[PDB]
Amino acid sequence: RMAEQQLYIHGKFVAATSGKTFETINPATGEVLATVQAAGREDVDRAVKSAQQGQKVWAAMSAMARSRILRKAVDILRERNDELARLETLDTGKPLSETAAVDIVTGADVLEYYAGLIPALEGSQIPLRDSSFVYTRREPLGVVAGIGAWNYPIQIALWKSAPALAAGNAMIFKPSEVTPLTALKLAEIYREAGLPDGVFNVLPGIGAETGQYLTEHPDIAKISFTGGVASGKKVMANSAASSLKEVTMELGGKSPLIIAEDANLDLAADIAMMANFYSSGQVCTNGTRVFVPAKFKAEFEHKILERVGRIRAGDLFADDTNFGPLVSFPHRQNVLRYIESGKSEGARLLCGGDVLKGEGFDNGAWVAPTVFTDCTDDMTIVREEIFGPVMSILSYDDEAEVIRRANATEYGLAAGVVTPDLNRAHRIIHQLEAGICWINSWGESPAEMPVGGYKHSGIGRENGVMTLQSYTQVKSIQVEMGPFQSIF
Amino acid sequence: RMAEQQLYIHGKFVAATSGKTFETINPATGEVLATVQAAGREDVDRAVKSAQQGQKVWAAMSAMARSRILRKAVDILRERNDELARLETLDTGKPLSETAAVDIVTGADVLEYYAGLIPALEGSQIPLRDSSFVYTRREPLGVVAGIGAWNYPIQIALWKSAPALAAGNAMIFKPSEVTPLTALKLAEIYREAGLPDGVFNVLPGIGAETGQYLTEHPDIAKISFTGGVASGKKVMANSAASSLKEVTMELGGKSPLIIAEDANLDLAADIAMMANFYSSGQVCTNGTRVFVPAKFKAEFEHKILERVGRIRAGDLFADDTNFGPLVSFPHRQNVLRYIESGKSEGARLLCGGDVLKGEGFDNGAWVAPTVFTDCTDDMTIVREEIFGPVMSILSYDDEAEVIRRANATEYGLAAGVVTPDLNRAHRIIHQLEAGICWINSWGESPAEMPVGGYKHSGIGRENGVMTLQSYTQVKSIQVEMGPFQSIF
Amino acid sequence: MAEQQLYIHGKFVAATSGKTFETINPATGEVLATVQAAGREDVDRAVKSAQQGQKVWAAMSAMARSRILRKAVDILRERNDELARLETLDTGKPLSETAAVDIVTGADVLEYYAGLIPALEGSQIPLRDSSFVYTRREPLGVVAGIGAWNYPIQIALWKSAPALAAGNAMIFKPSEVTPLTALKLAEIYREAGLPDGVFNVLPGIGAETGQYLTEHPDIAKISFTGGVASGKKVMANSAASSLKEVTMELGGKSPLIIAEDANLDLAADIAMMANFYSSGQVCTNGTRVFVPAKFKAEFEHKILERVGRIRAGDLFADDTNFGPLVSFPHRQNVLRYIESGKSEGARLLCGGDVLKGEGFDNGAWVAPTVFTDCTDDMTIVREEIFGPVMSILSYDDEAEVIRRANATEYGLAAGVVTPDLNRAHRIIHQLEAGICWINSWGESPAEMPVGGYKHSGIGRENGVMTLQSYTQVKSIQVEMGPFQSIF
Amino acid sequence: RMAEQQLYIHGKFVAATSGKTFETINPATGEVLATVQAAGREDVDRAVKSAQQGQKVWAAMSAMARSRILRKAVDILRERNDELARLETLDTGKPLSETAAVDIVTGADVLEYYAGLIPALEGSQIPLRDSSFVYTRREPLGVVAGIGAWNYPIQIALWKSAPALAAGNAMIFKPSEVTPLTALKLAEIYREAGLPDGVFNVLPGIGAETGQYLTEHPDIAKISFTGGVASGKKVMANSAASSLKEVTMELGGKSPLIIAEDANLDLAADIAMMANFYSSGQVCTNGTRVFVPAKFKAEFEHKILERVGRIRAGDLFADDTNFGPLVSFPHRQNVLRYIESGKSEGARLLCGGDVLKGEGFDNGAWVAPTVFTDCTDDMTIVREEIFGPVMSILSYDDEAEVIRRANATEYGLAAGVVTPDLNRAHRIIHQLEAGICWINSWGESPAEMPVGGYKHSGIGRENGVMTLQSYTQVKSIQVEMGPFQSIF
Ligand SMILES: CC(C)(COP(=O)(O)OP(=O)(O)OC[C@H]1O[C@@H](n2cnc3c(N)ncnc32)[C@H](O)[C@@H]1OP(=O)(O)O)[C@@H](O)C(=O)NCCC(=O)NCCS
Ligand SMILES: CC(C)(COP(=O)(O)OP(=O)(O)OC[C@H]1O[C@@H](n2cnc3c(N)ncnc32)[C@H](O)[C@@H]1OP(=O)(O)O)[C@@H](O)C(=O)NCCC(=O)NCCS
Ligand SMILES: [Cl-]
16 A cells, blocks of 8 residues: 555645545455545645636746646656556556556547647737727636546646646645545646646545535635536536536547448447447447347357457456456346346347456456447437446347437447448448447547537537637627717 | 416427426516416426427538528617517516617627538547548537526527537427516517427526526536526536536626726726626626726726716616616525625715606615625625625725635636736736636627636636527547458 | 620720720620720729728728628629620520529629628637737728629629628729629619729730739739639739739649449530530539540430530520630631641541521631540640530540549549449549539539639639638737746 | 858758859958859759759658758857858848847747747638538749848848748749858758758859749749839749749838827937938838928937937947948948938938948948938939938828828838827828838737738738748539539
């Protein structure tokens, strides 16, 4: 066990005044990775006053000065990629083959992107008449709060903190209690790059206490939350009741992958695998409802089974391992309950469905890669996000039907279609009710591409130019050079 | 009186199935203007199903076809300006001198503005590599809901419905129970202009029921609310708990008006008058904290007294009337309680402070134009929105001090400065924490200018190009033309 | 008809040149009208009129300008058929085209820009707490447009709409071949409430009236539509005189690529519309049709079947879809190109000569003409003909067709016909042209910027960007801090 | 002495095949700094084929890959700032107090700015109907040519190459024959940073041969030229006559500085000094027509003379030197002809008017700081750009008059106003016909700010986001998914 992990406030680690702690577990062994201090209500207020002071220094700097500091943070992240990836693997259970190639790399890509856009953040000017004009400023919100999830801890912290800092704000970040460690490292890296004290503070803790203290604080102007649909509704509600904060929410999904009647089934099966079993199924954007034409279903199932057999579970630091345990043991239990629900409702188990057993698996929160077929739109596993390695295969007959069924859900995060046909690809995608759409691929989320959910899957967007703007507030200023007329 | 007012669903007036009605009162005479049907839970569901069907027709039209229909609505509104203004006066008690020059004129201006921008609504295209690119669509939200306030009934209905419809949505509008009449007229006008049935439905009712049914409905994608700060928090919370709706909120303020030491005091007094006594003080953006340099306070007070003496209360249809009663007797009661708190807390009454009495006033909720001076930052009348004709005059000594005090509030809607000095005007305005800032003027809200609140005064914005975009949602589409690679 | 005058400051006025020219009806050979030609003094009058009007125009509110342009739109829709008939007499294009395309799409662009006027915005850039920058998009002032003869009224609208919408006054010179509809537009604009001087029309000869505009010191921009060679001279003269901003929409030799998986009925329909509309007198025409060798014979048969359905005749008849060429001198140039095709070894698939008989002997008719077995070195393949002459070329592989499609000084338009998702985007992204069509040809939405690569143009028309290109940026720095001198 | 300077083509120095050379002179001593090879027609053809090959490599990289390479060039330029400034001082005669603080600093600022914007370069997407949409690409022009001037050699090379390279083009740069040395250093710096071979080639030579050969070449897509008005017309003409190239031109001016009646005259005099005598008056944007109110003329003249007396000419590497010789002896002769016309036409000489003589000046191209007053709008020195240290003071009586006179010129590059009054500052500036306007300052040209001329002072702009886009060409693409209809 590491030394007791402290809070990060105003450029330094600092002891919590709450008197409370929590533990993070290595999901591959069950051992305690570390004891972590939990931020109390007084700790949150202290972090906010620190952030207010830092934000004023940060915002008073020039745009290019802020860009240079974020770019130095990028360089440090690239250099420390493997060290951070290893820590992320210990905390999350994700294979090093993933964490060393994706988590920090794509997190730093977004920070690098926004570092370069700071000088392009511009207001507007509007002429009204010769004697009057309007101009606008895109001003910082002030102090914002980001609340992270556990599947991509450092990536999420970068995707929230990068636009927030680039827009001139200070952010107080609360990582998930499951995976608090990499965010504390990120805080040191930012300071090492020259970020002014207070601009990025990290408050580990529990959602019911630390997260709620942030959502309630009167001087925080915005909350950005990544997490579950149910917890999101609570965060957004508490954020409104306290001080009417601006809100961004990235929640889960039940995204459909539509295989067209002209699709090559090797390509479709490869896309379905990457849409379901990367990060052991713990990805909000996963294509967990795979729609396949009835005439192809039997062949597609065989192609899925062959590729499931190639999945290589084992030591998370081994080069060939491409599948890990789930993030925690309680989470494994929920995934298993969904699997039992699939059996009890009559879905046909094609493969998996149980924990992994044997030396190297008995002490980890492993679930076998699991595929259900003969699925129907009313089944619990088809309707609800599992956030585990569980693919649901559904047969369909015609294009209009599959679009209706793909859209008949409260979720709206992602979608995809597999087809070589120009007209079919655009025609279908334009009709799907989702914010993130992939044609003949899955999963790639470039820094330039806004991503977020329709309907219950989210509020607002992340990434792209628009997210830099959404971390500012517009001030309109009218200059009246004419004589003002009063009717009184 | 008038005929019983029904609901407007799918291009026709229709009876409510709630079995409930309410009365709208003429605030100048006390007479029942009309009996109005109240939309029940089932009526809201009918309106949503109507809106869904109409929205599909609307969105499938070409952009210019939508533009032309809204422009026909503009032309009808210009032709009926005076008739609609007189109706607005009957329902609100605001003088015809105001309604015939502002309410419909500026409401129709915003509709004309967005009508012309529909064809300019564009997504983006982002090249990733030779073998892949991303493009974005700005898609309609679907069915959205507007909830109006009673001070500017038809203007609010136009400022919400114009961008929502121009963005390809259908809107269900709930007017305030105080002032439902003009919204029903607007619904007929839209139909007459060629708006497809269902695209604009109007559901009169009470906030506790009809408003709550809209915030709760699972198939409404966005709520846009104008009203008080307190009611706003309830709407925003209920929108999250039910279906995680996008939300826009335009709430009240306690906006500061800063008179600089080099200001001409006749101009300052004229601006203060217009910032406090228009629409009898029932304006969210009013400059109700008037900061005057200590050395000019006495002279400024004299100039206010002289201009207050010229305010002309009387017949609301006479050209020289420039002051009306408050919208209801309960609202006047609240304004009178604030005036009494001002007296009891030691503020000096400069003028007014009582109800108006005599023939032509006894049946209306009239309050005299009221000015308090010798005010301090801790007084109730200085800290809280009154929404009545009550100006608070505060003295200050230096620029840094006045900026602090101007910003030391939870409200953030508007602000202004009076100064002929180039540096002082821009320098002060840039430090003020408000979304709407006026230099040497007050009140003008051009269609091009985004307007909305900082902090507790609002979420999001109205008007400007950005509000058109905010009634769309982004879908990002990646076209991957290279061979997809699975790691499994 | 009545002797046609110049239009300056809201009225018809006699030219001071003492010179006139005649415009010929291309279907009968008869003189339609005698038109006065603007001299150097007339241009100076138009410019001073424009300077006075532009100030009135620019001082109005943005929405005031929008309403006036929208009222011109309403007048244009109501007089569509009348304007179309005049266009047919002057151009020779069938009424089936002029009543459905010329005024409709010209008015579409005017309607489009009318609505964007209030969205024209500058920027604001903070530098530090004590200094910021804001920009204005200011009118250029007086700008000049020089039209072509194939789409007289449409081109006048596509140039004047963004110019006026941006707050400028425009002096428009129509082609001497086709001056009549531009003068009608001038009246319509005035009837809509456009202030006097904001749109002046100066008919005349390119060698005189055009050159006087390109040389005038108080004109800030020249916008020219025409041939590549004429464009180079206009742009040079605009530079040598007063360093004007320039926009040029010139000709092309645009390629139409038929893919190996293309449906040949669709390909043939696209090739027909890309070659024989307006009798082949369209700058964006796909006059190089690349077809896979394995499909060439079938494609040739399908083209011939559709050429036989072409209906030449009375231009005011509903079923007529093919007209004479705009002038007899132009037909002479088109016939010389056809003879080179014959002499250089291209195989004549149909047409190749003038049309004869009652109703055709007195008009400047050329039959729909198709060459095949063409090679990249032939004159008919390398140079814009601007007549109804399709060249069919065979190809074997994708890389080859892209190299050959791009192997030209022209850069205006291009297209591909394919149902395959990857092939359509992949090929289009590599073609060196500004206007690219997938599984279609010819559509030019008001929202879509259009213009040429390489020798086919400078700048763009239509879309939001063209509104901005008719403004000039002024950057303004507000320095609220103390200024420090090193002296 | 330095080594014979060669051409830079495809990542290496290479001998010209023209057989021709020229010499660059140290303007402070008259000595030969270096012999420089002159590129002939064949060398130009080779550089274009090099550029075509390099441009393909550069454009096929990712946007962030291009961004990183330019950022490494920024880092090298910052580290080598003093060495580069010293070389520029030797080649131009500008004091090191200027070159080490401005030339490379602001040149590198612009490269840094555009490096970060590469990922934000985006096309558009326009929906037409359900069955068809349009998207646009911002494609590189290909090979572009920059032709520099001699007053700010390395800065001009950076301001032209930075947006051109950031947009994916290759640039062939021709420096002025007066000042070729720093451009060749920049080429090595770009290669050291990782710029692919051929993307930045430098061809020293004469305008009549090397300049003309580039403007004529069929495979160069755009010309960007900085220089005199007369040469500009010739460049723009040859660019059109050959292959109809896109053009950008930054030419000279006769920019007005308007001192208002309420201006502080010390501030006005400091601004006029910086607007006339920086770089010895060899700045295109200089405020050489100084309009002063008649009532303040005498006092303003006194304050100018006092500040002129502080000008410190001397050793160009000494810290306190703030005034240098002119760039060449032929240019001094032209400046002297203008000064003589000022005397002969009746303008009153307040100071200067002759060369500087004595030890340390006799071998340099020195002209004394010169001020004329009692100037009138018809004088040659008032109407024509001198590009030397010659200020013209003009008296005026009222605002309308000074605006007319300020605008009564074929030039349009810059302008400025000195006034503390809010209304006067914006009101006057909005009426001036110039692309670059300064209020209460002069000379600052932020990377974010587009700069360029009205009328004869230029075509197009430099700096700002718009200049990155102007180095691309728009391709519009319509996808028609519905059945195509032929009328034949
Ligand atoms: C561990 C597990 C229980 C999820 O944790 P949870 O307690 O349900 O919380 P959520 O993931 O919904 O919310 C994310 C974060 O919101 C915050 N949060 C929760 N309740 C909060 C509240 N009332 N106020 C403020 N913040 C709160 C916490 O920081 C939480 O981090 P956590 O994941 O460690 O709890 C897991 O078994 C699970 O259900 N995961 C499936 C998917 C999911 O619900 N969310 C993950 C991303 S979609
Ligand atoms: C520039 C030139 C080549 C144009 O060739 P062209 O297009 O065959 O010539 P045209 O006279 O038909 O010009 C076409 C259009 O440009 C117009 N035009 C010609 N000169 C113009 C000018 N200086 N300004 C404006 N418009 C001009 C013509 O009026 C005509 O308009 P319209 O036909 O639409 O009514 C020709 O005008 C010229 O100057 N010839 C001398 C050089 C030459 O022939 N080529 C040298 C080859 S090495
Ligand atoms: Cl050195």
